[PDB]
Scaffold this active site. Structure first.
Site, mmCIF file in Angstrom:
data_model
loop_
_atom_site.group_PDB
_atom_site.id
_atom_site.type_symbol
_atom_site.label_atom_id
_atom_site.label_comp_id
_atom_site.label_asym_id
_atom_site.label_seq_id
_atom_site.Cartn_x
_atom_site.Cartn_y
_atom_site.Cartn_z
ATOM 1 N N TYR A 145 -4.711 3.784 -2.084
ATOM 2 C CA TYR A 145 -4.585 3.551 -3.512
ATOM 3 C C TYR A 145 -5.303 4.321 -4.536
ATOM 4 O O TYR A 145 -5.498 3.942 -5.789
ATOM 5 C CB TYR A 145 -3.937 2.299 -4.214
ATOM 6 C CG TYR A 145 -2.893 1.599 -3.612
ATOM 7 C CD1 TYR A 145 -2.814 1.222 -2.197
ATOM 8 C CD2 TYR A 145 -1.746 1.502 -4.459
ATOM 9 C CE1 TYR A 145 -1.672 0.444 -1.707
ATOM 10 C CE2 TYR A 145 -0.614 1.021 -3.689
ATOM 11 C CZ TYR A 145 -0.507 0.397 -2.334
ATOM 12 O OH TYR A 145 0.417 -0.142 -1.925
ATOM 13 N N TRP B 4 -2.924 -16.266 1.928
ATOM 14 C CA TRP B 4 -2.949 -14.560 2.465
ATOM 15 C C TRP B 4 -3.479 -14.538 3.973
ATOM 16 O O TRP B 4 -3.229 -13.691 4.639
ATOM 17 C CB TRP B 4 -3.694 -13.795 1.612
ATOM 18 C CG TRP B 4 -2.778 -12.948 0.886
ATOM 19 C CD1 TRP B 4 -2.427 -13.273 -0.579
ATOM 20 C CD2 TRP B 4 -2.193 -11.531 1.211
ATOM 21 N NE1 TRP B 4 -1.424 -12.037 -0.773
ATOM 22 C CE2 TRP B 4 -1.490 -11.103 0.095
ATOM 23 C CE3 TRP B 4 -2.350 -10.952 2.550
ATOM 24 C CZ2 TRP B 4 -0.834 -10.092 0.352
ATOM 25 C CZ3 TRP B 4 -1.727 -9.665 2.570
ATOM 26 C CH2 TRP B 4 -0.869 -9.062 1.621
ATOM 27 N N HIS C 70 -7.670 -8.463 -2.192
ATOM 28 C CA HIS C 70 -6.928 -9.221 -2.748
ATOM 29 C C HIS C 70 -7.090 -10.124 -3.825
ATOM 30 O O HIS C 70 -6.143 -10.590 -4.745
ATOM 31 C CB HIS C 70 -6.535 -10.474 -1.883
ATOM 32 C CG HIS C 70 -5.676 -9.541 -0.429
ATOM 33 N ND1 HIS C 70 -4.772 -9.258 -0.508
ATOM 34 C CD2 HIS C 70 -6.189 -9.241 0.793
ATOM 35 C CE1 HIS C 70 -4.361 -8.357 0.393
ATOM 36 N NE2 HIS C 70 -5.240 -8.831 1.235
ATOM 37 N N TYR D 230 7.265 4.784 -9.057
ATOM 38 C CA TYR D 230 7.161 3.370 -8.678
ATOM 39 C C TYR D 230 5.951 2.407 -9.206
ATOM 40 O O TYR D 230 5.819 1.454 -9.847
ATOM 41 C CB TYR D 230 7.544 3.002 -7.132
ATOM 42 C CG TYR D 230 6.990 1.576 -6.645
ATOM 43 C CD1 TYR D 230 7.621 0.495 -7.252
ATOM 44 C CD2 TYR D 230 5.899 1.532 -6.131
ATOM 45 C CE1 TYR D 230 7.443 -0.844 -6.746
ATOM 46 C CE2 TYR D 230 5.615 0.034 -5.762
ATOM 47 C CZ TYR D 230 6.461 -0.833 -6.086
ATOM 48 O OH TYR D 230 6.141 -2.451 -6.003
ATOM 49 N N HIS E 278 -0.017 0.434 4.895
ATOM 50 C CA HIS E 278 -0.065 -0.679 4.280
ATOM 51 C C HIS E 278 -0.347 -1.937 5.158
ATOM 52 O O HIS E 278 -1.166 -2.738 4.574
ATOM 53 C CB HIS E 278 1.424 -0.867 3.871
ATOM 54 C CG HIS E 278 1.668 -0.430 2.302
ATOM 55 N ND1 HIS E 278 1.490 0.964 2.403
ATOM 56 C CD2 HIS E 278 1.683 -0.867 1.113
ATOM 57 C CE1 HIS E 278 1.702 1.459 1.157
ATOM 58 N NE2 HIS E 278 1.694 0.280 0.124
HETATM 59 O O1 LIG Z 1 2.820 -2.803 -0.713
HETATM 60 C C1 LIG Z 1 3.061 -2.601 -1.908
HETATM 61 N N1 LIG Z 1 2.509 -3.839 -2.827
HETATM 62 C C2 LIG Z 1 1.601 -4.799 -2.451
HETATM 63 C C3 LIG Z 1 1.160 -5.944 -3.472
HETATM 64 C C4 LIG Z 1 0.120 -6.763 -3.383
HETATM 65 C C5 LIG Z 1 0.237 -7.851 -4.050
HETATM 66 C C6 LIG Z 1 -0.759 -8.816 -3.962
HETATM 67 C C7 LIG Z 1 -1.604 -8.587 -2.936
HETATM 68 O O2 LIG Z 1 -2.637 -9.570 -2.606
HETATM 69 C C8 LIG Z 1 -1.727 -7.581 -1.951
HETATM 70 C C9 LIG Z 1 -0.858 -6.677 -2.169
HETATM 71 N N2 LIG Z 1 1.821 -5.699 -4.597
HETATM 72 C C10 LIG Z 1 2.453 -4.557 -5.118
HETATM 73 C C11 LIG Z 1 3.090 -4.514 -6.600
HETATM 74 C C12 LIG Z 1 4.092 -5.647 -6.762
HETATM 75 C C13 LIG Z 1 3.661 -7.004 -6.607
HETATM 76 C C14 LIG Z 1 4.775 -7.852 -7.022
HETATM 77 C C15 LIG Z 1 5.803 -7.517 -7.341
HETATM 78 C C16 LIG Z 1 6.213 -6.231 -7.555
HETATM 79 C C17 LIG Z 1 5.437 -5.251 -7.136
HETATM 80 C C18 LIG Z 1 3.028 -3.787 -4.062
HETATM 81 N N3 LIG Z 1 3.742 -2.948 -4.412
HETATM 82 C C19 LIG Z 1 3.870 -1.871 -3.132
HETATM 83 C C20 LIG Z 1 5.389 -2.087 -2.477
HETATM 84 C C21 LIG Z 1 5.459 -1.368 -1.024
HETATM 85 C C22 LIG Z 1 5.762 -2.227 0.079
HETATM 86 C C23 LIG Z 1 6.139 -1.814 1.304
HETATM 87 C C24 LIG Z 1 5.776 -0.499 1.497
HETATM 88 C C25 LIG Z 1 5.764 0.126 3.047
HETATM 89 F F1 LIG Z 1 4.710 0.450 3.686
HETATM 90 F F2 LIG Z 1 6.231 -1.121 3.832
HETATM 91 F F3 LIG Z 1 6.945 0.920 3.398
HETATM 92 C C26 LIG Z 1 5.492 0.409 0.635
HETATM 93 C C27 LIG Z 1 5.350 0.073 -0.751
HETATM 94 O O3 LIG Z 1 3.635 -0.676 -3.306
HETATM 95 O O4 LIG Z 1 2.454 -0.311 -2.459
#
Ligand SMILES: O=C1N2C=C(c3ccc(O)cc3)N=C(Cc3ccccc3)C2=N[C@@]1(Cc1ccc(C(F)(F)F)cc1)OO
Length: 191
Positions: free
Chosen positions: A186, A88, A18, A134, A171
Site C-alpha cells: 500500500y 487476528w 494491524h 476503491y 495480501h
Molecule cells: O485487503 C483489503 N483490506 C484489508 C483490510 C484490513 C483491515 C483491518 C486489518 O487489521 C487488516 C486489514 N481493510 C480494508 C479496508 C476495509 C475495511 C473494512 C470494510 C471495507 C474496507 C481492505 N480493503 C482491501 C480489499 C481487498 C480484499 C481482498 C483482495 C484480494 F487480494 F484477495 F484479491 C484485494 C482487496 O483492499 O486492500
C-alpha cells in the site's frame, strides 16, 4: 521461492500494521469497533461509491462479515484493541491452514466479491483507476502514488490489470505472514 506459509505474530511490525488498521477503522476514536460497523462500512463503500447492485453488495457483505468474524468480531459486540490483535492471530492461523491445504481463503473470497464490483468488465482484474477508486473511497490509501506502489509490488505495469490471483498472494503475505516480498503493498499508507 514462491511464497511464505509461516506466521510472524511476535514481529512488532506485524502488530503495528494491524494497529494502524485498527486506528483507521476506529474512526470515532472509541478504542473499540464492532462487526456492525465493519459490514456497514463495506456496503456503504460499494453501494454508495462504487455502483454495486444489491446482489453484489450482499455477496461482498458476506465476504467481509466472514473475514472480520474470523478475527473474533461479532454483531452487537465492541472489540477493543487487545481483543482485536488476539483475534487476528486466530484469523491469520485459520487462513494459513486453508492456504496450505490449497482451500479458498477468506481474503480471496473477499477479493472475488470486491473485484466483481470494481472491475467494470467483471472478469476479476482491475485497472489502476479502479484500484484508486476503491482504496480512496475506503480511505485505506489517500495518495495516488501509493496506489501505484501496489502495481509495482504485484509486478504489473500501471497500464495493466491486477488479477485476484496475484493480489491474493500479496495480501496473504502482507496481512498474514509478513512476507518481505510484499512490503510496501500500500505504498506509504500502511506500515
Ligand atoms: O485487503 C483489503 N483490506 C484489508 C483490510 C484490513 C483491515 C483491518 C486489518 O487489521 C487488516 C486489514 N481493510 C480494508 C479496508 C476495509 C475495511 C473494512 C470494510 C471495507 C474496507 C481492505 N480493503 C482491501 C480489499 C481487498 C480484499 C481482498 C483482495 C484480494 F487480494 F484477495 F484479491 C484485494 C482487496 O483492499 O486492500
Amino acid at each position: 521461492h514462491h511464497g511464505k506459509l509461516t506466521s510472524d505474530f511476535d514481529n512488532p511490525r506485524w502488530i503495528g500494521r494491524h494497529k494502524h488498521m485498527f486506528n483507521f477503522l476506529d474512526v470515532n476514536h472509541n478504542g473499540k469497533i464492532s462487526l456492525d460497523e465493519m459490514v456497514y462500512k463495506a456496503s456503504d463503500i460499494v453501494i454508495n461509491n462504487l455502483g454495486a447492485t444489491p446482489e453484489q453488495a450482499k455477496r461482498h457483505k458476506d465476504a467481509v462479515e466472514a473475514f472480520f468474524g474470523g478475527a473474533g468480531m461479532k454483531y452487537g459486540v465492541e472489540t477493543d484493541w487487545p481483543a482485536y490483535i488476539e483475534g487476528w492471530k486466530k484469523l491469520a492461523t485459520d487462513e494459513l491452514e486453508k492456504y496450505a491445504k490449497n482451500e479458498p481463503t477468506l481474503i480471496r473470497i473477499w477479493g472475488d466479491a470486491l473485484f466483481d464490483i470494481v472491475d467494470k468488465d467483471q472478469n476479476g482484474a482491475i485497472t489502476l483507476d479502479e484500484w484508486k477508486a476503491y482504496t480512496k473511497a475506503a480511505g485505506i490509501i489517500q495518495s495516488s502514488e501509493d496506489c501505484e506502489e501496489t502495481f509495482r509490488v504485484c509486478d504489473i505495469d500501471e497500464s495493466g490489470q491486477l488479477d485476484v490471483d496475484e493480489m491474493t498472494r500479496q495480501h496473504l503475505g502482507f496481512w498474514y505472514t509478513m512476507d518481505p516480498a510484499c512490503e510496501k503493498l500500500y505504498g506509504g499508507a500502511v506500515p
